[PDB]
């Protein structure tokens, strides 16, 4: 029909076709998952390798809001970086006024009013990226993923991208392992193998494992990158299970 | 190629050239050249040059084309599919026909933009006649023909009738002389006076022809 | 549609943007009920259960603007959160400039006037949700004002949001006709929830558990939303009377 | 006028063009070698033909006819000037320069109309001013 | 297709909207003028065909910009009064800043700049009325005749004919008039100018408005009997 | 049966290279990057236009470098009329 | 369908494609940059003897030692003329020095390469794209005699002999051969008139042809009607001997 | 796909990828081509200058932005000129407030958000020029590849322009060569000349065609021309 | 001709006169007939009304 | 259908009348029926109200608002269109008059300012015209009682009797032939109840019907006592309970 010409159009299906194609654009990107534990959250994202000219630990999309919140998105890279730079200013403006770290459910409202208003505006194009953010605030551990349509809720797990369907079955298995969930280091080892399983669609090329988490146990409320023996153990854990 | 309106530029110009050439006037209807049937299009076109191609006694004339001139894109919306094959094949008959000019082809159409550039083939048709507005000498030559047999009063002269005019064509000026004679029949006389031309010029250019010359840049 | 490209009244005198604005309200297919006791106002919204990747506790169709005041939204989610943050701004600014508690009458009237501004701006989308505001007035008492997507607001004895509103009104019309009052008996606010659950199940024809529903309670100078364990206590309290 | 199908054959009961496509497929493709025997068509629009013939394996090369450039339009006028009496001191390069890109017929019209303007001036040959008026007659009289 | 915007240069290299602006001039009033050695003469045509029209309260086509600089347009009277008003504002602004009188070259660049800025500005309509700016330079008797066109360009002409039948009268100005030796006397330039106007006016008096500009900041307006006096001299050969 | 993908046309062009005589230095995976929206029949016409590049390069056979110049466009389109900065 | 910003999966331009056609319909602007001087010339295009041949000029003087040529639509050109005149006194005001030809050419092209009303990181002047092309010549203390071409589409290029307008494709055919680094000032004046006469339809005289010269000693000097006629007589003498 | 959607850059395509990026990509392919690589201690870019005809001089595609940071211009000219003053203003702003030179990864982000605002805005003129940004900061040498979509990635080196496939293949087999050469800028330039020569059909091999600019720990970013680049050629 | 843009006053019509001015004269004739009279000693105004 | 230029508020209509104006009356015609009757000693107004759900509150809807104590108003159309219009109209009435002349605006000045907002709504692009039609009844010391029919186009005219909505044309012939200018307000109330009853016979009571009149001052509605100079409010809005008392005497 002629309703896809521009934004600010009410379609007969209740949602704009441009928003429908924006959701399909997320499925054309890489796979970014996440796990919400009791003491914190764990982020895992797969970066597609274009060729051997890529340098590791450079293009990593993991961003850190304040010290207690990590940020990762799956979708258009240029459209995603513009939201993180603006999303940091929203969390900074809270500290610039109230003088205290921003809580996660409040950090989602700043991005909510920011993105949802642009979907209502014709001059501003809606965002076609899905941003996954979380951490541990003064209240506790919280995880929220921002959909390209603007709707969001509390998420015990994060699934987006092309392999979100194959990763959804693996995230539901965490209840079968333990009723209370895995540990901090156990969630990193479990989320790593999921990346190798979702690679069957992207297996035409290579990948680099990217995992980050923030909890109150080891880092004591800091968001860092997985390295040392913890990163190498998560890689060999999946090689033995696939074999 | 002819332009203008029938009876003036699309008629008089066609019959005037055939007089001095001492050739028979052969009229072919343009709308009849398309029978909307496969094979009748090129058949009727080749037979035109056949009757005029033996001793070349006459000249081909075609007038009033609203049909074959416009093929559109389709057999509907005023166009026809047989027009595409008729115009394209008629080009071969224009190049194949060769003489010293005893036979000519004169076609009349309103717009040449809908014509096939193939059938046009510039250099085969170098003649384009655009309709021009009649000058002061145009009306004077039309009056002299009718005023010869029509007696004029002492107040009727040549410069009097051409004083106020919209530059009507040679045919419309003839209608003004007929209206002047119609008022003479009301007074029962054979000599049209000057009072009839004053009422005739107002009826012909307004009542008998509706123009009114809409102004304000139009 | 030659005249369909824009938002105007059209040659048929019918707004075609409102045609799809009401259809978006049923996109979520959520049925809610709003009733008013004598001294209290209790609203109940249906909480849909998604898969295990989502938290049902975080999912709420009822937003808290301030104390005693609440908003029930049935329709598109992205238009609900943007209107929730906007409705709270007018509530706080009114308590400053005019220094008075913003009533649900003006709160639904302000959203109605703000809805025309959305239609006045060709680059801005009107609200495609159903704004239902409930509160307890100091004078008028319990009152319900629901703002339609077209900007219409009127008081309701017992309203509803959904395709079943025709069946919900029928059962609640004869209940208020015999007693000749628009308020539920048992002035205690704990017993008002018992009737709000009872009249809703028979109206919708489907009984729901504690995880399929959410129950808000608006009292005088206090407002709260019952958790998953408090809703279970309401079903047990129905059997004890 | 033929193509791969038509109304009286593809949509009709008679077989003329419907059996013509068989000779362009069975004979040319199967039996006839590609080197010695070749086939070339001419059409105003590609869509007027059968989409079955437009598929690869038979009809592949599509040659679009452009219009001559300044150098191409100059070499055409100098050839027509051999059969037409003109002035020995004219220049055919400036004649084709004023005229924009034109078809093969529109270029021959410049030389034929050049003798028409010489009739008004009563001259046996066409001077340079006659070709300049012939180009303006094509530019103004057509405007295509 | 390409006539809906001013920001398109068109495939033909010329905006069709500018060509349509010339059609209003061809159906509008006529403006013809010729400058001599010591003077410039600007004629025009005001249509008296409307009955019950008062010529005294009707402003003349020729408008006064500067003491030594006048202006006469050809086209719609609506868009012309703005071009006259905007020029008069800058005409006074020259003495407010430079203290010198209005320069014909400087005034033309402003009037052409008015149509230039509105053409370049999107969503703003330019002026499709062609104006003729004539006058003398400060402390100079040399006449300067400039024109304005809908294309946003200006050209300098010794004699120019615009309006209805601009080409017919132009042939009269390319033969009897000589730029190498323009008429020295005022009577020779005015009498020949009337003959050029009789083609479009066709034997009329109040339909001709001629304003003769003289040096030392002088403006004279020929009356109805004075304009008709030259008409009799030109038509004397036809009645002789 | 939509238009084949990038890697979907690499196997089709590989079979077309086996039917003809080449240098066998051609990597079918590298030439699939220059193809955009081609079906199984259109790729057969590309191999015909790719062999014509050998005549312009002055080669008796068709090497891998002759395909790279023939698979891009090398037909019609907007050509050289506008290139770089006009 | 065009569509401006919306292209076809081929991707020529639109306003630039229409700009090249508008430039080729303008006046012929021919110039040659040599070691001993830079000579420019234009075709005034006189359609009638009543049209002045000295009041209107397509060659504007930006600086005493720096000239410029204008071929195209004059309406959108005068916006660049006042900008070039402003940029001329700009470098004189701030740095109190004569700006180089390459530095002045880039400063003028800064305005031609941008358009639009909306501003983000730069001020906005042009409300719509302009297609006016200019030929900037002059002499500086570093590169000496230089001749450039101002293109509203891309970056300017350095041309020793450049011809635009309706005489572009015609004049540039002979500029790839007859041009040489040893051409003197007198040889450059006769080389332009020899090419200008072939690319011009009307006869060559002082009325329809006005040239100019740019040197270090005399700066920007315009050939008068008497000096131009003397160079025309010397041109017919050289053509008669060859 | 003719029309039916994509009135401006705001409208998404049915596939979900805006085709305005591919339209601006043709300007990069039809524009100039450049080849460059880097190492731990050095970064180099070899640009191929373009012109019109023999009378037209070759224009340098490398514009100086920062002392330690440089890039090359392949794409539309008016898009790269506005971004040149934007990146240079950020380098001066970083050298004013922070006083440190602008980082490579920070230069690519401000460049990404610059064209992202005009892309999401109604209408506008999105930047279609490709840029390869090299520079040396406290974090070392880095190379970013800019695309008209706004994507920014990190590579040892790449090539954007006409016939860019030849250089990409050469950098894959030589990947382990130039990365192990440190402190010797001569070997990195020799590899760059052989890299661009393989990607080109060899139209004009002369000296004035190639423009080499190298930056490193000791020697800062400097454009070489004339006899400076004639030693390797 | 067939292509007419009446939306903006800035777009010039192929005839040269804006179509909004053409049909504005019709709205004048649709209203009541008003007759002004200018005299030597004053002005007489007589007009009807549309309702 | 024919030309969109009639619908565009920035473009003159090819048909001589803007299509946006004529089709905006259709939206007003689709609404309920509102009328008014102008007499010598007063002006009565009556209208029918939306019932909506059977549980909807009938006391919430008020289609007769208060501008000034000497001027009443009634509307038929969209809900927010009247609210946004009058909320700004009350500010213009106070700013342009009460902040200058320090009184309540008269009938001629107030109604003229109401139509000016509709003029800007039908002029500037992107702003849709109002879908309501206001019938304003007021009394002043100069012109006396006045009844003005305000159309969304922005043109107001005096009317002794008029109707809007679906029953606009139907009740126009009724109110013209039934009512005469020489009658009083008491007979005007009874006629207004009979004509409005013809729209719907389901419920004629004060729940779905609002009734208000204009006239002399009321000392009980003044709010203060002791000042003989200042008269009480001239406008009195009848309570729905008091409307049933008038219906029993009908």
Swiss-Prot record, chain A:
Disulphide bridges: none
Residue intervals passing through the bilayer: none
Any GO MF annotation of the entry: mRNA binding
Post-translational modification: The alpha and beta forms are probably products of the same gene with different post-translational modifications.
GO (cellular component) term, any one: proteasome complex
Major localization listed first in the record, in broad terms: cytoplasm
Keywords: Acetylation, Cytoplasm, Nucleus, Proteasome
Compartment(s) of residence: Cytoplasm; Nucleus
GO biological process, alphabetically ordered: proteasomal ubiquitin-independent protein catabolic process; proteasome-mediated ubiquitin-dependent protein catabolic process
Quaternary state and interactors: The 26S proteasome consists of a 20S proteasome core and two 19S regulatory subunits. The 20S proteasome core is composed of 28 subunits that are arranged in four stacked rings, resulting in a barrel-shaped structure. The two end rings are each formed by seven alpha subunits, and the two central rings are each formed by seven beta subunits. The catalytic chamber with the active sites is on the inside of the barrel.
Extra remark: Present with 12000 molecules/cell in log phase SD medium.
Family (UniProt): Belongs to the peptidase T1A family.
UniProt-recorded name of the protein: Probable proteasome subunit alpha type-7
Species the sequence originates in: Saccharomyces cerevisiae (strain ATCC 204508 / S288c)
Gene: PRE10
Residues of the full protein shown: 6 to 248 of 288
UniProtKB/Swiss-Prot annotation, chain H:
Encoding gene (name): PRE5
Subunit field text: The 26S proteasome consists of a 20S proteasome core and two 19S regulatory subunits. The 20S proteasome core is composed of 28 subunits that are arranged in four stacked rings, resulting in a barrel-shaped structure. The two end rings are each formed by seven alpha subunits, and the two central rings are each formed by seven beta subunits. The catalytic chamber with the active sites is on the inside of the barrel.
Source organism: Saccharomyces cerevisiae (strain ATCC 204508 / S288c) (Baker's yeast)
Cross-link (Glycyl lysine isopeptide (Lys-Gly) (interchain with G-Cter in ubiquitin)): 190
Any one GO CC term of the record: proteasome complex
Protein name per Swiss-Prot or TrEMBL: Proteasome subunit alpha type-6
Note: Present with 7210 molecules/cell in log phase SD medium.
Gene3D superfamilies: Glutamine Phosphoribosylpyrophosphate, subunit 1, domain 1
InterPro entries: Ntn_hydrolases_N, Proteasome_alpha, Proteasome_alpha-type, Proteasome_asu_N, Proteasome_sua/b
Curated annotation (Swiss-Prot), chain I:
Subcellular location: Cytoplasm; Nucleus
Signal peptide start-end: none
SS bond list: none
Family: Belongs to the peptidase T1A family.
Record's miscellaneous remark: Present with 17100 molecules/cell in log phase SD medium.
Function: The proteasome degrades poly-ubiquitinated proteins in the cytoplasm and in the nucleus. It is essential for the regulated turnover of proteins and for the removal of misfolded proteins. The proteasome is a multicatalytic proteinase complex that is characterized by its ability to cleave peptides with Arg, Phe, Tyr, Leu, and Glu adjacent to the leaving group at neutral or slightly basic pH. It has an ATP-dependent proteolytic activity.
Oligomer status and interactors: The 26S proteasome consists of a 20S proteasome core and two 19S regulatory subunits. The 20S proteasome core is composed of 28 subunits that are arranged in four stacked rings, resulting in a barrel-shaped structure. The two end rings are each formed by seven alpha subunits, and the two central rings are each formed by seven beta subunits. The catalytic chamber with the active sites is on the inside of the barrel.
Protein name, entry field: Proteasome subunit alpha type-3
Organism: Saccharomyces cerevisiae (strain ATCC 204508 / S288c)
Residues included from the entire protein: 2 to 52 of 258
UniProtKB/Swiss-Prot annotation, chain J:
Other facts noted in the record for this chain: Present with 7060 molecules/cell in log phase SD medium.
Gene encoding the protein: PRE8
Keyword Chloroplast part of the UniProt annotation: no
InterPro entries assigned to the protein according to its UniProt record, in alphabetical order: Ntn_hydrolases_N (IPR029055), Proteasome_alpha (IPR050115), Proteasome_alpha-type (IPR023332), Proteasome_asu_N (IPR000426), Proteasome_sua/b (IPR001353)
GO cellular component, one term: proteasome core complex, alpha-subunit complex
Protein name: Proteasome subunit alpha type-2
Family indicated by similarity: Belongs to the peptidase T1A family.
The protein's role, per its UniProt record: The proteasome degrades poly-ubiquitinated proteins in the cytoplasm and in the nucleus. It is essential for the regulated turnover of proteins and for the removal of misfolded proteins. The proteasome is a multicatalytic proteinase complex that is characterized by its ability to cleave peptides with Arg, Phe, Tyr, Leu, and Glu adjacent to the leaving group at neutral or slightly basic pH. It has an ATP-dependent proteolytic activity.
Keyword Zinc tagged: no
């Amino acid at each position: 029909t002629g309703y896809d010409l521009s934004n600010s159009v009410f379609s007969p299906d209740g949602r704009n076709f441009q928003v429908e194609y924006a959701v399909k654009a997320v499925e054309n990107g890489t796979t970014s998952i996440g796990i919400k534990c009791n003491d914190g959250v764990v982020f895992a994202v797969e970066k597609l390798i274009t060729s051997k000219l890529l340098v590791p630990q450079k293009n990593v999309k993991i961003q850190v809001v304040d010290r207690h919140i990590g940020c990762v998105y799956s979708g258009l890279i240029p459209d995603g970086r513009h939201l993180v730079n603006r999303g940091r200013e929203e969390a900074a403006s809270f500290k610039k006024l109230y003088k205290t770290p921003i809580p996660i459910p409040a950090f989602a409202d700043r991005l909510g009013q920011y993105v949802q208003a642009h979907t209502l505006y014709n001059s501003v194009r809606p965002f076609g990226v899905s941003t996954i953010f979380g951490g541990v605030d003064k209240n506790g551990a919280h995880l929220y993923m921002l959909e390209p349509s603007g709707s969001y809720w509390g998420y015990k797990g994060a699934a987006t991208g092309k392999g979100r369907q194959s990763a959804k079955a693996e995230l539901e298995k965490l209840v079968d392992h333990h009723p209370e969930g895995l540990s901090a280091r156990e969630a990193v080892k479990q989320a790593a193998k999921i990346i190798y399983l979702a690679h069957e669609d992207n297996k035409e090329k290579d990948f680099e494992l990217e995992i980050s988490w923030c909890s109150l146990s080891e880092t004591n409320g800091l968001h860092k990158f997985v390295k040392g023996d913890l990163l190498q153990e998560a890689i060999d854990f999946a090689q033995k299970e696939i074999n | 190629i002819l332009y203008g309106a029938p009876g003036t530029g699309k008629t008089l110009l066609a019959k005037a050239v055939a007089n001095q050439t001492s050739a028979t006037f052969l009229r072919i209807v343009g709308s009849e050249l398309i029978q909307k049937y496969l094979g009748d299009g090129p058949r009727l076109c080749r037979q035109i040059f056949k009757v005029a191609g033996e001793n070349a006694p006459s000249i081909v004339f075609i007038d009033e084309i609203d049909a074959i001139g416009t093929k559109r894109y389709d057999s509907n919306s005023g166009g026809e599919r047989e027009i595409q094959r008729t115009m394209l094949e008629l080009l071969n008959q224009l190049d194949g026909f060769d003489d010293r000019g005893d036979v000519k082809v004169i076609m009349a159409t309103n717009k040449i933009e809908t014509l096939d550039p193939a059938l046009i083939r510039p250099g085969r048709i170098d003649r384009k006649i655009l309709f021009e507005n009649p000058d002061l000498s145009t009306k004077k030559k039309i009056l002299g023909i009718h005023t010869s047999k029509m007696n004029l009063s002492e107040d009727v002269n040549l410069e009097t009738l051409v004083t106020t005019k919209d530059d009507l064509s040679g045919a419309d000026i003839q209608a003004m002389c007929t209206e002047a004679g119609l008022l003479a029949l009301r007074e029962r006389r054979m000599q049209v006076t000057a009072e009839d031309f004053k009422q005739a010029k107002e009826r012909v250019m307004k009542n008998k022809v509706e123009e009114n010359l809409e102004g304000l840049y139009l | 549609g030659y005249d369909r490209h824009i938002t105007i009244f059209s040659p048929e005198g019918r707004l075609y943007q409102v045609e799809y604005a009401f259809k978006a309200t049923n996109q979520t297919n959520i049925n809610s009920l709003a009733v008013r006791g004598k001294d209290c106002t209790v609203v109940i919204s249906q909480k849909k259960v998604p898969d295990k990747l989502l938290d049902p506790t975080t999912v709420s169709y009822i937003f808290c603007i301030s104390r005693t005041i609440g908003m029930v939204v049935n329709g598109p989610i992205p238009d609900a959160r943007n209107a929730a943050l906007r409705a709270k701004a007018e509530a706080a600014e009114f308590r400053y400039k005019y220094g008075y508690d913003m009533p649900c009458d003006v709160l639904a009237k302000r959203m109605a006037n703000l809805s025309q501004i959305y239609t006045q701006r060709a680059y801005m989308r009107p609200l495609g949700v159903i704004l239902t505001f409930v509160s307890v007035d100091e004078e008028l008492g319990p009152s319900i004002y629901k703002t339609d997507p077209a900007g219409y607001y009127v008081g309701y004895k017992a309203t509803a949001t959904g395709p079943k509103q025709q069946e919900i009104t029928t059962n609640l019309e004869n209940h208020f006709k015999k007693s000749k009052i628009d308020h539920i008996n048992e002035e205690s606010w704990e017993k008002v929830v018992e009737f709000a659950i009872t009249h809703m199940i028979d109206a919708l024809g489907t009984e729901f558990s504690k995880n399929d529903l959410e129950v808000g309670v608006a009292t005088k100078d206090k407002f709260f939303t019952l958790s998953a364990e408090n809703i279970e206590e309401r079903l047990v309290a129905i059997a004890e009377q | 006028a033929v193509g791969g199908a038509r109304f009286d054959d593809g949509a009709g009961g008679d077989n003329e063009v419907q059996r013509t496509m068989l000779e362009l497929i069975t004979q040319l493709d199967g039996f006839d070698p590609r080197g010695n025997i070749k086939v070339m068509f001419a059409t105003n629009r590609p869509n007027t033909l059968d989409p079955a013939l437009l598929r690869p394996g038979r009809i592949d090369r599509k040659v679009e006819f452009s219009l001559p450039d300044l150098e191409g339009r100059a070499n055409i006028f100098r050839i027509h000037s051999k059969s037409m009496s003109v002035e020995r001191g004219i220049r055919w390069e400036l004649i084709s320069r004023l005229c924009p890109n034109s078809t093969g017929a529109e270029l021959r019209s410049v030389c034929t109309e050049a003798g028409m303007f010489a009739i008004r001036a009563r001259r046996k040959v066409a001077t340079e001013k006659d070709f300049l008026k012939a180009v303006d007659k094509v530019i103004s009289g057509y405007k295509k | 297709g390409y006539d809906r915007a001013l920001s398109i240069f068109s495939p033909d290299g010329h905006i069709f909207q500018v060509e349509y602006a010339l059609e209003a001039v061809k159906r509008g009033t006529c403006a013809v003028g010729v400058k001599g050695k010591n003077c410039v003469v600007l004629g025009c045509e005001r249509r008296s065909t409307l009955k019950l029209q008062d010529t005294r309260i009707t402003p003349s086509k020729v408008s006064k910009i500067d003491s030594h600089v006048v202006l006469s347009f050809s086209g719609l009277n609506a868009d012309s009064r703005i071009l006259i008003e905007k020029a008069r504002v800058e005409a006074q602004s020259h003495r407010l800043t430079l203290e010198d009188p209005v320069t014909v070259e400087y005034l033309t660049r402003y009037v052409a700049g008015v149509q230039q800025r509105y053409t370049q500005s999107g969503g703003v309509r330019p002026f499709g009325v062609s104006t003729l700016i004539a006058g003398f330079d400060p402390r100079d008797d040399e006449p300067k005749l400039y024109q304005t066109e809908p294309s946003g360009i200006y050209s300098s002409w010794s004699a120019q004919t615009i309006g209805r039948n601009s080409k017919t009268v132009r042939e009269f100005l390319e033969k009897n008039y000589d730029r190498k030796e323009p008429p020295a006397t005022v009577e020779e330039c005015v009498k020949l100018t009337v003959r050029s106007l009789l083609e479009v006016v066709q034997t009329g008096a109040k339909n001709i408005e001629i304003t003769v500009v003289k040096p030392d900041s002088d403006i004279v307006a020929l009356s109805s009997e004075e304009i008709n006096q030259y008409v009799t001299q030109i038509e004397q050969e036809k009645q002789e | 049966f939509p238009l084949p993908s990038e890697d979907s046309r690499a196997q089709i062009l590989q079979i077309h290279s086996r039917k003809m005589t080449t240098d066998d230095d051609i990597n079918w995976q590298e030439l699939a990057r220059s193809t955009d929206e081609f079906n199984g029949a259109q790729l057969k016409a590309v191999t015909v236009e790719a062999g014509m590049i050998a005549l312009r390069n002055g080669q008796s056979s068709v090497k891998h470098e002759d395909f790279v110049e023939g698979i891009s466009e090398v037909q019609a389109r907007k050509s050289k009329s506008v290139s770089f900065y006009a | 369908d065009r569509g401006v910003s919306t292209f076809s999966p081929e991707g020529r331009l639109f306003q630039v494609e229409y700009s090249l056609e508008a430039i080729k319909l303008g006046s012929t602007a021919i110039g040659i940059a040599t070691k001993e001087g830079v000579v420019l010339g234009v075709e005034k295009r006189a359609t009638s003897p009543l049209l002045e041949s000295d009041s209107i000029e397509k060659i504007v003087e930006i600086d005493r030692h720096i000239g410029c040529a204008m071929s195209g639509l004059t309406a959108d050109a005068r916006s660049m003329i006042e900008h070039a005149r402003t940029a001329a006194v700009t470098h004189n005001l701030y740095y109190d020095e004569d700006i180089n030809v390459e530095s002045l050419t880039q400063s003028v092209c800064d305005l031609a390469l941008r358009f639009g009303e909306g501003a983000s990181g730069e001020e906005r002047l042009m409300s719509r794209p302009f297609g006016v092309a200019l030929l900037i010549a002059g002499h500086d203390a570093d590169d000496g005699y230089q001749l450039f071409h101002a293109e509203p589409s891309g970056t300017f290029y350095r041309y020793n002999a450049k011809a635009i307008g309706s005489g572009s494709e015609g004049a540039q055919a002979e500029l790839l051969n007859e041009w040489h680094s040893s051409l003197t000032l007198k040889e450059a004046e006769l080389l332009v008139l020899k090419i200008l006469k072939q690319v011009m339809e009307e006869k060559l005289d002082e009325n329809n042809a006005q040239l100019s010269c740019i040197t270090k000693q005399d700066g920007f000097k315009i050939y008068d009607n008497e000096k131009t006629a003397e160079l025309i007589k010397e041109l017919k003498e050289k053509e008669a001997a060859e | 796909f003719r029309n039916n959607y994509d009135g401006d850059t705001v409208t998404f395509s049915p596939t979900g990828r805006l085709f305005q990026v591919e339209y601006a990509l043709e300007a990069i392919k039809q524009g100039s081509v450049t080849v460059g690589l880097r190492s731990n201690t050095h970064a180099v870019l070899v640009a191929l200058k373009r012109n019109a005809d023999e009378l037209s001089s070759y224009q340098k595609k490398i514009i100086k932005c920062d002392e330690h940071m440089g890039l090359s211009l392949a794409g539309l000219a008016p898009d790269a000129r506005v971004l040149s003053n934007y990146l240079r203003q950020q380098c001066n702003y970083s050298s004013l407030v922070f006083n440190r030179k602008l980082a490579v990864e920070r230069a690519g982000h401000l460049l990404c958000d610059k064209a992202q605002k005009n892309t999401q805005s109604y209408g506008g003129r999105p930047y279609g020029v490709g840029l390869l940004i090299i520079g040396y900061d406290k974090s070392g040498a880095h190379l970013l590849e800019f695309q008209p979509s706004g994507n920014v990635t990190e590579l040892y080196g790449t090539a954007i322009g006409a016939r860019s496939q030849g250089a990409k293949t050469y950098l894959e087999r030589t990947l382990d060569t130039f990365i192990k050469i440190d402190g010797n800028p001569d070997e990195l330039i020799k590899a760059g000349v052989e890299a661009i020569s393989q990607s080109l059909r060899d139209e004009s091999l002369t000296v004035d065609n190639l423009s080499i600019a190298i930056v490193g720990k000791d020697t800062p970013f400097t454009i070489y021309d004339g006899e400076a680049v004639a030693k390797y050629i | 001709g067939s292509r007419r843009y009446d939306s903006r006053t800035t777009i010039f019509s192929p005839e040269g006169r804006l179509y909004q001015v053409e049909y504005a004269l019709e709205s004048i004739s649709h209203a009541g007939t008003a007759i002004g009279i200018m005299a030597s000693d004053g002005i007489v105004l007589a007009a009807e009304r549309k309702v | 259908m024919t030309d969109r230029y009639s619908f565009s508020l920035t473009t003159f209509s090819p048909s001589g009348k803007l299509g946006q104006i004529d089709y905006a009356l259709t939206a007003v015609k689709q609404g309920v029926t509102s009328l008014g009757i102008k007499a010598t000693n007063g002006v009565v107004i009556a209208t029918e109200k939306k019932s909506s759900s059977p549980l909807a509150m009938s006391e919430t809807l008020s289609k007769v608002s208060l501008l000034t104590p000497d001027i009443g108003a009634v509307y038929s159309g969209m809900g927010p269109d009247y609210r946004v219009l009058v909320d700004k109209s009350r500010k213009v009435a106070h700013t342009s008059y009460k902040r200058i002349y320090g009184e309540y605006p008269p009938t001629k000045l107030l109604v003229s300012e109401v139509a000016k907002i509709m003029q800007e709504a039908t002029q500037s692009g992107g702003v849709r015209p109002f879908g309501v039609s206001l019938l304003i009844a007021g009394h002043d010391e100069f012109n006396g009682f006045s009844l003005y029919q305000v159309d969304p186009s922005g043109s107001y005219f005096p009317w002794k009797a008029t109707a809007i909505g679906k029953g606009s044309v139907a009740a126009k012939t009724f109110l013209e032939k039934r009512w005469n200018d020489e009658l009083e307000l008491e007979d005007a109330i009874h006629i207004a109840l009979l004509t409005l009853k013809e729209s719907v016979e389901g419920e004629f009571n004060g729940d779905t019907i609002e009734l208000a009149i204009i006239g002399d001052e009321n000392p009980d509605l003044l709010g203060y006592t002791g000042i003989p100079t200042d008269k009480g409010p001239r406008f009195r809005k009848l309570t729905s309970q008091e409307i049933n008392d008038r219906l029993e005497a009908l």
